[PDB]
Symmetry: D3
Subunit: 271 residues, 6 copies
């Protein structure tokens, strides 16, 4: 298993820029072509929510064009910036397991050594996350049924506070429900999130829990300052690899940079 | 607790550049001034190994000058590129807990809600890591006496393979001795490493285990390809914060980038 | 009093770029977000003319939306690139004190220790500036009424030759009439202008007279060469502050640059 | 008269970078080559103090090499980071008009329509400026003898506070003495200063008073915050030109940027577009 | 004679970017203004094919506007990404000497010491080049009538393989027909081509044969790897100059870069340094 | 045959920069590592003169270390900036085929399908090129020796004027002697030169004649202007490849740039 995992694309409508000046559409199209050009090719691409910025049909038309040009199987989940019904309308042909109920989108993938669980933590009319009873029951059923096989969950909102003054108030509101699932099921070992536009990682019992950077604009972590900052610090994605019994995640830069070159001992330490 | 954690500085001697072209001395002096300018100031700065590139006295002269200009308490550990005896000579006044035995450098910090354990996984004559009997014994004693107080270990070499073709052959060779300690001591929940010049994270039982990017040059993760690449993809460090019961780590960019600006809902979704 | 003073925005219609390649609309949206994000917030933003590039209705639609997203009271005046009627129609709601006569747009502001006088020096069918009889009488009356209260005038066109080969022929054609006002009224101590896309400054009796850089492209100063050049040298604005009895202007960069860091005596001069 | 005017070069010793990471020596060598390559060549180059960073003889060796490669007559004055004796020992050959007394370095230039007065406002032991009695007396003598001929003063420290929280406490401490000269002598119409690493301008009676950007690093203007910031925002110099009866100053970017191109009416307002 | 020669502009529809992220329309607008701003002004500009990306009418609307804004006579030829009928409809008014037959667009220019020959090697339904009987027969007639006077051919597709694994399979399929004319006619001493988005040159008998860089995106030369790579490595055009008896071609960067400065002996080899 | 061909490296002594601000030493060390990292490995690397800037011993020290770290056989020739005796002393161990006479450095290589002839056109006391009686006699002998086997000459100075106002006066002054050999010997079909810091190409009879870009700073071609300009427009090398009967040269960028990506029909022309 190799997954390429990106988040928070924030597509805008045709010929608009984010905030009038960040060309998210072009930036994301570069990202798509970079993923398409990888020498070690992913088995699939994950996009963990906030696919569009404003929930508009015209933004989804751009998302479908750019995401649909990815040359991989896609696993897509909504964020709070998404509109559930439009997300299904425009993206279900790119991820057929999202199904037909805008309010119960979720799916499991059993192709690999670890089970993958994709859920919707977004809730209409708020930035905060919410896990419904049906999502929780479905999770319990999948973890129960999976038995001994490890599982990873992908969701938009972090299920616990991370100390980030901007982002904490809008985390997953009843995230304790999912934390109760990591207590009950030892096989649940990864929870990966979007929303925070930052690589922020913590550990609860046996599960590693981590947010991801955005594909374009980032949000700095502040512990006290609640001013709503964003910036254009370097974007990246996370690569997830099955390595024996270990699930290993590593950061892959989406910036254009100098190199690579080859290490040579004579060049490293000249005489 | 707020820690700024940087790694793999690879200082060169005065007026020399890494590989003849990467100005590590200047990039590191920038980094130092960046850390000195932080608005939310860390309590301490960790540097997790490969302080110098060639283990030369004249490189430690530079390292002492630049690291010596950080306005913070420092916790310094060696890597495989370091010379243990010069490390003590030139850096012990900056981290006095390193003591006077070049072959037994380690120390524990009890100032915070989580215990900090700093060790030397480096071995002379090899790039591979090695945990000595003295080190493993000291670790067991710390963890036994710590009781239910959480513990974090900082070491140069990762204690398990991560699937990185370049890096796995030179991980910590007897790292299973540390994995045995994670098994035995549930309070051991974080292990942070240098060496890989990449943010690569995994989980073993209750312990989150992660390598850090370098402060200057980076090493791409490859699964198959053994060619020894390095590049100038974006540099960063890790900030570690105690957030109630959770240790939270987040990535802090050391690049110069555009912004911050302030999110405004009108600008975000114009009419 | 703190004023942020920008000039010569040259907005184009939606999705268009200046000369087909300079993204003025994006650059200006970035500027507006910079101004909104200032820690020391100005009391008002001045925009001294050439708001649009071609005087077209769709350019004004973009200007109204982008300038309308500034979180400040605005003072707007036209330049030669503007169209007076459309300027009034689209922009007057953002600056109502201009009145409702497109041919006599001007205003006095008395909120601060120094009186602010905003006038229209643009003339239909020409790049040249022109001061109407009405504007001059209004100016004389304002300056009589004001007595020993200091006054600053903002206008598009500079009142006198500056030796700039490209710009001098298209300065204020009857600028002598404003210079006459400077001789007669010791209270008139500042004249700030757009048009030249350059920080150019001179003194006539008690008055400091300065043109401003543009927000995007700049015009180099050449003494002999009349080739009509432009460039993308760095953009800035002037901040104007009342410091006791002094009106102080300082340049504020609108470029994205490395820093800031903190000065440290021992880093500056190491031993 | 055309003058190129740069300030606060802050040269470091050979093979040293400012703060360990800003290559001030390389940046200044680029600036010198930029000034040498100008199509419209200045009559002289002014450098208004803080020529070196630490007052060290090794920094003066570098300053002398780099400023000595300028293909122009130089007018140099010190700043607080300069050491008076070393400044004269190393730089007097580049600007012999300053004399041979390190405590009284100044000169007047009468070649042009406006008289140019260069003074040392620096004072040993402090960052603050200070006008000595001999400087003040020399100034009064020049201004008296100049009569109706306009005059421009170049000095390191600004002679009045400008609202800059970091820089104001270290302005010219007896600046009021020079402001009294502005009142007395109507032909004194320009005072140009370094020190602030910022283009900050104001007017006091008939005199325009402006500080300059540095050639490398800059200092942001902050009204309340005393935190000693600096940054690498774009560097520039000031060009000063006599245009008829007007002294005109314009900013000349020292950054490397795209262009120039030529304006074309058809390209500006295309018949195809909204 | 001075010609500025650009190639492979790949214009897109108004508001569209190439592959969604390369702003070819803006990049080409910058290039046009760069050409308009040249101090040493060319006598004409050559554009050697792949004018639009997808052969669509909306792309030709953009090409016509931007190429239309060049302040020079234009010599335009198609590439495989062009549609011949639309190319003629939209661009013939910019290069009327092509004629009125979309299937037989070529022209010869006799203004200079060397004859210029512009031909269309593109063929509908394929990326490969193809020299038609009409084209070869007209080339022969031009070369034969030309007698002594040297000749230069401008065509989209290279007429021989160049060892480029990506590009060779889509060269001029019957390029041998043009190599046969090189053999027959010692007058024919240059053939310049687009298609490859690379400066690649070779020599066949008396003729120098060269492909050009693109104005925006480039294509790396690979000898074995057939992965279809492209990149944003530096763009440039070729300038062609008659220099007495020699035709001289030189690379002109279209990138925005630092400089120029002026060389100085004192600065090149300082007396202070090793 | 694959040759990587660079030129005009202009090395300075350790710690020095060209003109005080162009870091030739780092730029060239970057180039050397780029060449070492090439996927399609050249058979050899040619460096066609002006190896050092000032002809000083400490410059040759830097050149020897940096060029010595190329993992390829080298063919090195001097330019006018080089000193013949010091060139031999420091660089002849890197290219022993040159011989042991400083005033007669040259060699012929028969390894490939095209013979390679390396000559010294530099002359003490001048920037102009000169072919000595010995050099010209040797070339004649070698062209007799090659018979119908093709030949390529590498030299520093171009043997004919190219209309470049700065460079023509200091071309190879008796270059006509080489043009005479082209006429006599039809297998001589390439002449490659340094000196001009420009890709400028022409054809004389059967011989293609081309100057190369430098590795760092470039010289613009001007027809009339003799002002001695240099700039930092993009650097490159030429790769020379034997392709059946054709010698093919192609430009290889030494800049760091975005990409590569993979072309995709549906991304190129969306529907
Ligand atoms: Co988001
Ligand atoms: Co969100
Ligand atoms: Co390391
Ligand atoms: Co290591
Ligand atoms: Co304007
Ligand atoms: Co105007
Ligand atoms: Co200073
Ligand atoms: Co100072
Ligand atoms: Co093409
Ligand atoms: Co083509
Ligand atoms: Co050279
Ligand atoms: Co040369």
């Amino acid at each position: 298993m190799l997954l390429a995992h990106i988040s928070d694309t924030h597509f805008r409508s045709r010929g608009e820029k984010l905030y009038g000046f960040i060309d998210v559409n072009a930036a994301n199209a570069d990202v798509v072509s970079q993923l398409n050009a990888l020498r070690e090719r992913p088995d699939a691409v994950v996009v963990s929510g906030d696919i569009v910025n404003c929930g508009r049909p015209e933004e989804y038309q751009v998302a479908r064009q750019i995401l649909g040009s990815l040359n991989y199987p896609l696993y897509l989940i909504p964020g709070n910036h998404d509109d559930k019904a439009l997300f299904l309308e425009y993206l279900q042909p790119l991820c057929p397991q999202l199904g037909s109920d805008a309010n119960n989108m979720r799916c499991a993938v059993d192709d690999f050594a670890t089970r993958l669980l994709f859920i919707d933590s977004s809730r209409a009319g708020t930035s905060k996350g919410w896990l419904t009873d049906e999502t929780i029951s479905w999770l319990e059923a999948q973890l129960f049924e999976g038995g001994d096989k490890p599982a990873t969950i992908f969701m938009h909102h972090p299920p616990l506070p991370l100390g980030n003054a901007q982002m904490d108030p809008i985390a997953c509101e009843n995230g304790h429900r999912l934390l109760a699932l990591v207590e009950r099921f030892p096989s649940l070992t990864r929870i990966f999130c979007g929303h925070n536009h930052s690589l922020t990682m913590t550990q609860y019992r046996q599960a590693l829990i981590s947010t991801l950077p955005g594909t374009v604009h980032q949000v700095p972590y502040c512990h006290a300052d609640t001013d709503p900052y964003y910036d254009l610090s370097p974007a990246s994605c996370l690569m997830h690899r099955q390595v024996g019994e270990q699930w290993v995640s590593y950061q892959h830069s989406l910036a254009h940079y100098a190199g690579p070159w080859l290490y040579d001992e004579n060049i490293s330490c000249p005489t």
